[PDB]
Design a protein around this ligand. Structure first.
Ligand SMILES: [Zn+2]
Ligand SMILES: [Zn+2]
Ligand SMILES: [Zn+2]
Lengths: 78, 586, 103, 187, 190
RNA sequence: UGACUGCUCCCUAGCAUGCUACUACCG
RNA sequence: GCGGUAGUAGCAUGCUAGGGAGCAG
């Protein structure tokens, strides 16, 4: 149950990243696609988590993009 | 789709097909909208019209709801029930609807051409949301009757500031001064190309340069307008006085150079909104800075309708107190880049009604609220959820010209939402700051409309000018040029040595445009002398029928001076007890 | 679809060691995928056949295809379903197959 | 369906015929009563089903319009819905490295490139205040994303190199603070 | 449905018969009433049915002819569009090199694959990586298809300008690599 | 930017056939 | 007294047309 959760979270994260016009940079989009496709094919739940950290770092390293703090104060992420 | 009809307190998906703003009316509410007047067409999630190919029925009173579609009268498969029946129109919320007791709100004010005084009369006899609908419909009618005139263009170019200009096909031309900015676009073959901002007053066509230009063939200049979106926040905040001075960051020192500041400081301590009625020199120059120093860290927002009036405070808002705590953002339009521009993060954010984003703030100190409907009040109260408000302004500061006036001038009190409230409940602060304006203006202006609030602070040395004169008029299609009081002003300035250091403002820019050809005094407009008040002045009226010599449209523009004035008046109304020094014509 | 996933989880699904798990997803592709997939035609090579054996295999296949009937039909006997699909290049700049079957 | 004139006429005819028959009578009266009754009965029975079909059809139409309006509404809030959903699932995952980096980004310490996974390759972050430097950087090692990194370079907003010994409590507030640490992943 | 030709006769007969009934006359007048009204309604029946059939037939005919007219309009506009496209693409044939290679043919027929190879004015090259780049279009002018081409522009996968001074071995991993090179025929066509 | 086939479920409209019912005409 | 015919209503059956969706090669 800890593996399907991370696969669903990865799908949602890739959708959110695509909504922010990331595919307008070929290298970043290729890396994101590779990570997302690698997570869904995983068999053990440690490689999936490190790839998840790597994929989330892409969204976190975009200043304007989204508001981390507002999205953390809505009874959401801590 | 799903909006809100609020008089009947009814969520709706319907809207009137032929009306001003595609207004939202519930089932019974759309019904008495379509029987009290003639609006026989409605719009829903899908528009009601017969769906057979080639058929055409605009009316809704005879359509039927067929097999998951709509069919009609002339072309009639009638296996259905009628759309309009039993005091209602078919749609969602067909059960949770109330109706309207006042049947003719839209039927009265949304059915006329939005130019009579009755529109504004009823708008002031409304609720907050009803008057919001009113103000948005006034902006809509302003734009929709501005988009009915021509587009100026320069096809062969001449030397700058003296060109040629042909216009459009058959349409009339609007008024003539710089009120309408001629900022159009250029076309190479199919696209729009950088043009700049222009303004046409003098025509051989003399232009005023908001920028320096190299005009090419065909360049077109006209205001292309969008439509103001609906707003989601109320204009005025309800009056609730504070329990204490809880939540404030008090200071130890007390302002001394300003002699009417401490009690008003305490007032801001327990006052929630603050509007007063004052000419230039009423704390707008120094009281804002007084609050700025008296509460340092409070989120205080300032704004004027143009950047040159925001500048009147911002020029030393960084000198009186540190620079690091003010800003206003400049779009690119005549705006001043003095402060920290492109910087949302600040403390004393200055602003312009035209543009500012929303992050947060706590205290409101906003300047003039004059030349706009409830849009100005609502955008700024949506801009910030503030704990304190100071609506510096005046129903006669720059009273919004009602586009093409046709029926008289309304009472000044009846402004957007606060000026009628203003002297029916009393002035919000005790404040009068006549440290620039003298008593020679204050006497008449306070005896007329601003009773007992401003002081006769400074005396006069018997130089104020009087000369009895009736005058003759000569008008044009959009302005007028003056023979007699212009000549009298000339031959008056030829008598006194130190009088050629004044301004030459004009009801329309044509007066100074004509005068620049043979004398050359600087251009001035009655639109907005934004934050630029000077002592010696030459004022002119030319033609004064309904826009000038009626009420305090520019009685603040009569508050010109500091130790000496000229104010030409060609009528016999605003002199009843004025005691300017009587001297004969030369 | 989060609601369905939560409903399934609240009923004892997707536990560890179960014999039912998700292995069908929507996979994403990068920019240079169409050409990379088209480049798989490199596996098509010119091949010569044994003609004397193919000429007999074709007879046996024709024997297999013997219980049917066929021929040519007129333009008014043609049945088309879903006339709202693409018409190819360069005909996709002006309409679907309905436009060309009506015009 | 008891709100139509046909129902009233049929009910009156039914009552009259029933009373007359129960009282007992001849054949002609029964024949006349039934000939005046059956037409009203058919009149009632037609509308009794026409009204039902009309009502159910109206209900279906309102259902369809509600569905269309809801779909149109739903397909116009996707960005906010997806972001809220993503952060909800990120809460529910409850991982230490993800929580660490999310809190770090929430306080101001965001990365500048993709976080590497190998025992090599460079990582660059931004440290905007002294408190974050105190929490993360102590000594010459760097703790980020539940890992260990080794500082090798410090660069300020003026791009001048700052040595590690320089940074201290009172010795810091004379510097361009948005520092940029570049480290490599410790084994 | 109310002014049919038989409506006048039917209504007048019904009114007269019911007036006779209200007169309280004998049973013979009642029998005559019943027969006359029965035959009147019977004759009104087909007059009320056939008209309703005919109206629906006429409506269907109108709808079909309207849709036929719409189809014809669409056909005309698609014909205009196709003609415009053909005549627009005609104007780039380079009618001197094409004529020069057509006349050399022994009967006027030439393969289609050699027309762009010998008459085109512009060349586009797509390069996967740097090793392939340094073997195909190194420098500023290169030779391909027995002709000389000179480079005019280089862009990347994101369609941004790239200068040849930064296409090196060290700087290779910093570019969106599917590079596109544009050249012109030197001394020949453009 | 959305290929060619095959099968199945749901909703509406029309046509044909059958069952029952209500009046009326004819013998 | 029985049958035939003409409209009207409800119900059932199979096709054609339109729309929405699912699976397979
Ligand atoms: Zn209306
Ligand atoms: Zn209403
Ligand atoms: Zn119709």
């Amino acid at each position: 149950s800890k593996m399907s959760d991370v696969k669903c979270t990865s799908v949602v994260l890739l959708s959110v990243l695509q909504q922010l016009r990331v595919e307008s940079s070929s290298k970043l989009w290729a890396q994101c696609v590779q990570l997302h496709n690698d997570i869904l094919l995983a068999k053990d739940t440690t490689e999936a988590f490190e790839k998840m950290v790597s994929l989330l770092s892409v969204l976190l390293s975009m200043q304007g993009a989204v508001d981390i703090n507002k999205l953390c104060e809505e009874m959401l992420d801590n | 789709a799903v909006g809100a009809c609020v008089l009947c307190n009814s969520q709706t998906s319907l809207r009137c097909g032929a009306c001003i703003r595609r207004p939202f009316l519930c089932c019974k509410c759309c019904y008495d909208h379509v029987i009290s007047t003639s609006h026989k067409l409605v719009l829903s999630v899908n528009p009601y019209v017969c769906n057979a190919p080639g058929c055409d029925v605009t009316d809704v009173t005879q359509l039927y709801l067929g097999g998951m579609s709509y069919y009609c009268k002339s072309h009639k498969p009638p296996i259905s029930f009628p759309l309009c029946a039993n005091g209602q129109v078919f749609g969602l919320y067909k059960n949770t609807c109330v109706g309207s007791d006042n049947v003719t709100d839209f039927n009265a004010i949304a059915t006329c051409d939005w130019t009579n005084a009755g529109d504004y009369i009823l708008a002031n006899t409304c609720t907050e949301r009803l008057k919001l609908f009113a103000a948005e419909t006034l902006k809509a009618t302003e734009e929709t009757f501005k988009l009915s005139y021509g587009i100026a263009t320069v096809r062969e170019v001449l030397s700058d500031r003296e060109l040629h200009l042909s216009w459009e096909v058959g349409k009339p031309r609007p008024p003539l001064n710089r009120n309408y900015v001629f900022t159009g676009y250029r076309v190479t073959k199919n696209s729009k190309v950088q043009i700049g901002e222009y303004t046409f007053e003098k025509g051989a066509v003399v232009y005023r340069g908001t920028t320096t230009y190299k005009l090419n063939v065909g360049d077109y200049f006209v205001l292309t307008s969008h439509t103001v979106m609906p707003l989601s926040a109320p204009t005025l905040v309800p009056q609730e006085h504070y329990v204490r001075i809880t939540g404030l960051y008090p200071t130890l020192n007390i302002s001394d150079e300003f002699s009417s500041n401490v009690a008003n400081y305490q007032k801001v301590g327990m006052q929630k909104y603050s509007t007063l009625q004052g000419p230039p020199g009423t704390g707008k120059s120094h009281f804002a800075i007084g609050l700025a120093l008296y509460y340092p860290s409070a989120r205080i927002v300032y704004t004027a309708c143009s950047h040159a009036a925001v500048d009147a405070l911002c020029e030393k808002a960084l000198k009186y107190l540190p620079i690091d705590k003010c800003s206003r953002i400049i779009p690119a339009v005549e705006c001043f880049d003095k402060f920290k521009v492109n910087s949302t993060l600040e403390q004393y954010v200055f602003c312009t009604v035209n543009a500012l984003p929303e992050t947060t703030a706590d205290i409101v100190v906003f300047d003039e609220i004059s030349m706009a409907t409830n849009y100005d009040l609502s955008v700024v109260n949506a801009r910030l959820r503030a704990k304190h408000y100071v609506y510096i302004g005046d129903p006669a500061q720059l009273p919004a010209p009602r586009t093409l006036l046709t029926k008289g001038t309304l009472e000044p009190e009846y402004f957007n939402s606060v000026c009628r409230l203003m002297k029916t409940i009393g002035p919000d602060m005790f404040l009068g700051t006549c440290r620039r304006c003298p008593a020679e203006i204050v006497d008449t202006v306070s005896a007329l409309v601003y009773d007992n609030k401003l002081k006769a602070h400074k005396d006069k040395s018997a130089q104020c000018f009087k000369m009895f004169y009736k005058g003759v008029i000569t008008h044009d299609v959009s302005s007028a040029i003056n023979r007699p009081q212009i000549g009298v002003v000339r031959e008056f300035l030829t008598r006194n040595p130190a009088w050629r250091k004044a301004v030459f403002i004009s009801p329309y820019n044509s007066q100074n445009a004509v005068a620049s050809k043979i004398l050359g005094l600087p251009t001035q407009t009655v639109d907005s002398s934004q934050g630029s008040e000077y002592d010696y002045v030459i004022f002119t009226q030319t033609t004064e029928t309904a826009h000038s010599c009626n009420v305090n449209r520019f009685n603040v523009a009569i508050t010109r001076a500091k130790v000496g004035i000229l104010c030409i008046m060609s009528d016999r109304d605003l002199y009843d007890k004025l005691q300017f020094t009587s001297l004969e014509i030369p | 679809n989060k609601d369905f996933y939560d409903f399934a989880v609240s009923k004892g699904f997707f536990k560890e060691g179960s014999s039912v798990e998700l292995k069908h997803f929507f996979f994403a592709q990068d920019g240079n995928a169409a050409i990379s997939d088209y480049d798989y035609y490199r596996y098509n090579l010119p091949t010569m056949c044994d003609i004397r054996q193919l000429l007999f295999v074709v007879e046996v296949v024709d024997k297999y295809f013997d219980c049917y009937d066929g021929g040519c039909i007129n333009a008014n006997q043609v049945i088309v379903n879903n006339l709202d699909k693409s018409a190819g290049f360069p005909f996709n700049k002006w309409g679907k197959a309905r436009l060309y079957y009506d015009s | 369906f008891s709100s139509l004139p046909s129902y009233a006429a049929f009910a009156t005819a039914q009552e009259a015929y029933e009373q007359a028959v129960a009282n007992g009578d001849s054949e002609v009266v029964l024949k006349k009563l039934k000939k005046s009754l059956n037409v009203a009965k058919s009149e009632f029975d037609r509308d009794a089903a026409m009204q039902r079909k009309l009502e159910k059809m109206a209900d279906q139409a309102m259902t369809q319009m509600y569905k269309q309006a809801r779909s149109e509404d739903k397909r116009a809030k996707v960005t906010s819905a997806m972001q809220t959903m993503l952060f909800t699932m990120l809460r529910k995952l409850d991982n230490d490295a993800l929580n660490n980096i999310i809190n770090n980004a929430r306080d101001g310490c965001v990365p500048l490139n993709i976080i590497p996974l190998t025992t090599a390759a460079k990582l660059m972050v931004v440290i905007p205040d002294y408190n974050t430097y105190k929490n993360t950087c102590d000594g010459t090692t760097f703790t980020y994303a539940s890992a260990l990194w080794e500082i090798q370079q410090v660069v300020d907003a003026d791009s001048k190199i700052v040595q590690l010994s320089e940074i201290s409590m009172d010795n810091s507030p004379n510097l361009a603070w948005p520092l940029i640490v570049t480290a490599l992943r410790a084994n």
